[PDB]
Short mmCIF file of N, CA and C in Angstrom, two decimals:
data_model
loop_
_atom_site.label_atom_id
_atom_site.label_comp_id
_atom_site.label_asym_id
_atom_site.label_seq_id
_atom_site.Cartn_x
_atom_site.Cartn_y
_atom_site.Cartn_z
N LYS A 287 -69.61 92.73 106.37
CA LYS A 287 -69.32 91.37 105.74
C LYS A 287 -70.09 91.28 104.45
N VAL A 288 -69.43 90.95 103.36
CA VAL A 288 -70.12 90.69 102.10
C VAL A 288 -69.44 89.53 101.42
N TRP A 289 -70.25 88.72 100.77
CA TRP A 289 -69.68 87.56 100.04
C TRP A 289 -70.66 87.21 98.91
N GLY A 290 -70.12 86.45 97.93
CA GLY A 290 -70.95 86.01 96.81
C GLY A 290 -70.31 84.78 96.18
N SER A 291 -71.18 83.95 95.63
CA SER A 291 -70.76 82.74 94.91
C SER A 291 -71.63 82.70 93.65
N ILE A 292 -70.97 82.56 92.50
CA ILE A 292 -71.69 82.52 91.23
C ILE A 292 -71.00 81.59 90.26
N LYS B 15 -66.99 80.86 90.98
CA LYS B 15 -66.38 82.15 91.55
C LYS B 15 -66.93 82.35 92.93
N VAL B 16 -66.07 82.54 93.92
CA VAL B 16 -66.52 82.91 95.25
C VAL B 16 -65.55 83.92 95.81
N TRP B 17 -66.11 84.86 96.56
CA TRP B 17 -65.24 85.89 97.19
C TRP B 17 -65.98 86.40 98.45
N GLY B 18 -65.17 87.03 99.33
CA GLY B 18 -65.74 87.60 100.54
C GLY B 18 -64.81 88.69 101.07
N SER B 19 -65.43 89.65 101.72
CA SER B 19 -64.71 90.75 102.35
C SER B 19 -65.37 90.93 103.73
N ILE B 20 -64.54 90.94 104.78
CA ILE B 20 -65.05 91.09 106.14
C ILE B 20 -64.09 91.87 106.99
N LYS C 170 -76.45 81.72 91.65
CA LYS C 170 -75.84 83.01 92.23
C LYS C 170 -76.39 83.22 93.60
N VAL C 171 -75.53 83.40 94.59
CA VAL C 171 -75.98 83.78 95.93
C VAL C 171 -75.01 84.78 96.48
N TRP C 172 -75.56 85.72 97.24
CA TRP C 172 -74.69 86.75 97.86
C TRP C 172 -75.43 87.26 99.12
N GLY C 173 -74.62 87.89 100.00
CA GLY C 173 -75.21 88.46 101.21
C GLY C 173 -74.27 89.55 101.74
N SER C 174 -74.89 90.51 102.39
CA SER C 174 -74.17 91.62 103.02
C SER C 174 -74.82 91.80 104.41
N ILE C 175 -74.00 91.80 105.45
CA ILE C 175 -74.51 91.95 106.81
C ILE C 175 -73.55 92.72 107.66
N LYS D 274 -79.06 93.60 107.04
CA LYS D 274 -78.77 92.23 106.41
C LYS D 274 -79.55 92.14 105.13
N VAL D 275 -78.88 91.82 104.03
CA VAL D 275 -79.58 91.55 102.77
C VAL D 275 -78.89 90.39 102.10
N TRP D 276 -79.70 89.58 101.45
CA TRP D 276 -79.14 88.42 100.71
C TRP D 276 -80.12 88.07 99.58
N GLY D 277 -79.57 87.31 98.60
CA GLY D 277 -80.40 86.86 97.48
C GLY D 277 -79.76 85.63 96.85
N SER D 278 -80.63 84.81 96.30
CA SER D 278 -80.21 83.60 95.59
C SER D 278 -81.08 83.56 94.32
N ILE D 279 -80.43 83.41 93.17
CA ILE D 279 -81.14 83.38 91.90
C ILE D 279 -80.46 82.45 90.93
N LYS E 235 -68.38 82.92 109.39
CA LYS E 235 -67.92 81.72 108.62
C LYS E 235 -68.82 81.65 107.35
N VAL E 236 -68.21 81.27 106.23
CA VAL E 236 -68.97 80.99 105.05
C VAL E 236 -68.39 79.72 104.48
N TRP E 237 -69.26 78.93 103.87
CA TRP E 237 -68.78 77.66 103.23
C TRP E 237 -69.62 77.43 101.99
N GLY E 238 -69.06 76.60 101.10
CA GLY E 238 -69.83 76.18 99.93
C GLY E 238 -69.20 74.93 99.34
N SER E 239 -70.03 74.24 98.56
CA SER E 239 -69.61 73.07 97.82
C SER E 239 -70.33 73.10 96.47
N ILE E 240 -69.62 72.88 95.37
CA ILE E 240 -70.25 72.78 94.02
C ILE E 240 -69.72 71.56 93.26
N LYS F 240 -75.23 71.96 94.65
CA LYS F 240 -74.45 73.05 95.33
C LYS F 240 -75.12 73.25 96.72
N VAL F 241 -74.30 73.52 97.73
CA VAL F 241 -74.84 73.90 99.00
C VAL F 241 -73.97 75.04 99.47
N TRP F 242 -74.59 75.97 100.18
CA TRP F 242 -73.80 77.12 100.74
C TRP F 242 -74.40 77.48 102.09
N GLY F 243 -73.58 78.19 102.87
CA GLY F 243 -74.09 78.73 104.12
C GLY F 243 -73.16 79.84 104.62
N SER F 244 -73.74 80.65 105.49
CA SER F 244 -73.02 81.72 106.15
C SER F 244 -73.55 81.80 107.58
N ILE F 245 -72.65 81.87 108.57
CA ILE F 245 -73.06 82.06 109.98
C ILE F 245 -72.22 83.17 110.66
N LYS G 167 -77.84 83.78 110.07
CA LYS G 167 -77.38 82.58 109.29
C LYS G 167 -78.27 82.51 108.02
N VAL G 168 -77.66 82.12 106.91
CA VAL G 168 -78.42 81.85 105.72
C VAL G 168 -77.85 80.59 105.15
N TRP G 169 -78.72 79.79 104.55
CA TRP G 169 -78.23 78.52 103.90
C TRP G 169 -79.08 78.29 102.65
N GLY G 170 -78.51 77.46 101.78
CA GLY G 170 -79.28 77.04 100.61
C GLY G 170 -78.65 75.78 100.00
N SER G 171 -79.49 75.09 99.23
CA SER G 171 -79.05 73.93 98.49
C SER G 171 -79.79 73.96 97.15
N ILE G 172 -79.07 73.75 96.04
CA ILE G 172 -79.71 73.65 94.70
C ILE G 172 -79.18 72.42 93.93
N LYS H 278 -84.68 72.83 95.31
CA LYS H 278 -83.91 73.91 96.00
C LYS H 278 -84.58 74.12 97.39
N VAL H 279 -83.77 74.38 98.40
CA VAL H 279 -84.29 74.77 99.67
C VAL H 279 -83.42 75.90 100.15
N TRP H 280 -84.04 76.83 100.86
CA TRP H 280 -83.24 77.98 101.40
C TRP H 280 -83.86 78.34 102.76
N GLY H 281 -83.04 79.05 103.54
CA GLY H 281 -83.54 79.59 104.79
C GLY H 281 -82.62 80.70 105.28
N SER H 282 -83.19 81.53 106.16
CA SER H 282 -82.46 82.59 106.83
C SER H 282 -82.99 82.66 108.26
N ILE H 283 -82.11 82.74 109.24
CA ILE H 283 -82.51 82.93 110.66
C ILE H 283 -81.67 84.02 111.33
#
């Protein structure tokens, strides 16, 4: 699982 | 920007 | 910026 | 598990 | 589950 | 901004 | 679980 | 800002 918010 | 892979 | 990998 | 917020 | 609000 | 992952 | 608020 | 991880 990988996620990002920028 | 948001994204995810699972 | 926030991100995580698990 | 790794994560970061900056 | 992942969530966010901006 | 608020975020979370579970 | 990880959470944050900015 | 507040953050946590459990």
